[PDB]
Design a binder for this molecule. Structure first.
Ligand SMILES: Nc1nc2c(ncn2[C@@H]2O[C@H](COP(=O)(O)OP(=O)(O)O)[C@@H](O)[C@H]2O)c(=O)[nH]1
Lengths: 170, 191
């Protein structure tokens, strides 16, 4: 059992590090033959926060990179969305900025949002200035964080903060 | 390897051809065939993509994939409830990955789809098509919570069709069907 079940979306283009962010999460196995051949879009993790146990079920939707017109698919039916850009690539930052602006418009206030610049450890190759992203995030009232999925730095804190801001809402 | 790849190429054409005709269930099954074959033959997207240089997915195809993507993604998450959160989300999520695999065989990473607006499939029509496919590939012993999977899919298909007949299709009513695990039925379903 658990006390809460939160549903999270992980949005971001290929190559930015979504899979590496989810390394603490586990895949449901399936006695279903059809599933075992293919696999699934989501991973699960139970955590403890403020004396409450929370099951996080997080979607890294397959094929999202193909369909970047922002519909409800990106902002309905989720307690939290985590938007990830590659800190060493300006075009991925320009892309999430655009999408996160569009989500912000339609999204209900109840959906929580977090901007994540990933690959902070590639400091020689780093192109996107955090103070630019930080101020973009501030402009929309959204938290911002830089992470290294490989080193696992600020990854835990990203999910724990997100989980804490949903939990306070409900 | 040379002839395995060419058999994968034709299986891909078959799925793309199914797509060109708006045959949803037929596209999903052909994509299933392609996936199973490449897994058996140990082929990956990278191996087959060069062979597809001269093939292409139409704007019509990209329109149907987008409808399928949008509907499956919403269904996977709505189906995750306090009753059960793995099998039904898994089944729907696996349909989505299967369709993403078809596109990855053809497309470089982060290449966008160019869908045709006038060929969008309405979300209620895709959902039945997804459930009809799940019904057909689910193991006869598969269960969602306490219900047989095939039987629950029939019940949800009929529920959505009833909403369409009375012209009562909206996100609220659809979410009720997608989140339902048949808790208010009078039987645990079976053969
Ligand atoms: N240096 C570094 N590389 C990363 C980090 N996160 C992901 N990567 C690299 O980026 C590439 C793709 O990451 P991946 O997990 O596949 O992201 P996804 O494809 O979008 O799910 C891989 O080669 C990773 O090793 C990070 O924090 N630091």
């Amino acid at each position: 059992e658990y006390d809460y079940l939160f549903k999270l979306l992980l949005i971001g283009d290929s190559g930015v590090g979504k899979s590496c962010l989810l390394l603490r999460f586990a895949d449901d196995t399936y006695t279903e033959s059809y599933i075992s051949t293919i696999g699934v879009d989501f991973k699960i993790r139970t955590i403890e926060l403020d004396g409450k146990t929370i099951k996080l079920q997080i979607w890294d939707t397959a094929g999202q990179e193909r369909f970047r017109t922002i519909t409800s698919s990106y902002y309905x039916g989720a307690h939290g969305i985590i938007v990830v850009y590659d800190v060493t690539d300006q075009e991925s930052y320009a892309n999430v900025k655009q999408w996160l602006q569009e989500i912000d418009r339609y999204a209900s206030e109840n959906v929580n949002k977090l901007l994540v610049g990933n690959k902070s450890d590639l400091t020689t190759k780093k192109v996107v200035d955090n103070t630019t992203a930080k101020e973009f995030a501030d402009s929309l009232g959204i938290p911002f964080l830089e992470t290294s999925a490989k080193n696992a730095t600020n990854v835990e804190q990203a999910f724990m903060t997100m989980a804490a801001e949903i939990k306070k809402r409900m | 390897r040379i002839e395995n790849l060419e058999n994968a190429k034709k299986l891909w054409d078959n799925a793309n051809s199914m797509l060109e005709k708006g045959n949803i269930s037929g596209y999903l099954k052909a994509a299933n065939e392609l996936h199973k074959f490449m897994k058996e033959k140990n082929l990956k997207e990278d191996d087959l993509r060069p062979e597809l240089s001269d093939k292409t997915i139409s704007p019509k195809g990209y329109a149907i994939l987008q409808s399928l993507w949008g509907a499956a993604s919403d269904y996977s998450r709505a189906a995750a409830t306090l009753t059960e959160s793995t099998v039904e989300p898994g089944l729907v999520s696996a349909v989505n990955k299967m369709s993403a695999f078809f596109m990855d065989c053809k497309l470089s990473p982060n290449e966008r789809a160019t869908p045709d607006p006038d060929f969008k499939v309405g979300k209620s029509k895709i959902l039945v098509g997804i459930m009809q496919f799940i019904k057909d590939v689910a193991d006869p012993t598969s269960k969602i919570w306490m219900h047989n999977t095939k039987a629950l899919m029939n019940h949800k298909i009929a529920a959505i069709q009833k909403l369409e007949r009375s012209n009562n299709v909206n996100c609220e009513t659809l979410e009720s069907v997608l989140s339902s695990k048949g808790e208010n039925l009078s039987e645990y379903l079976s053969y």
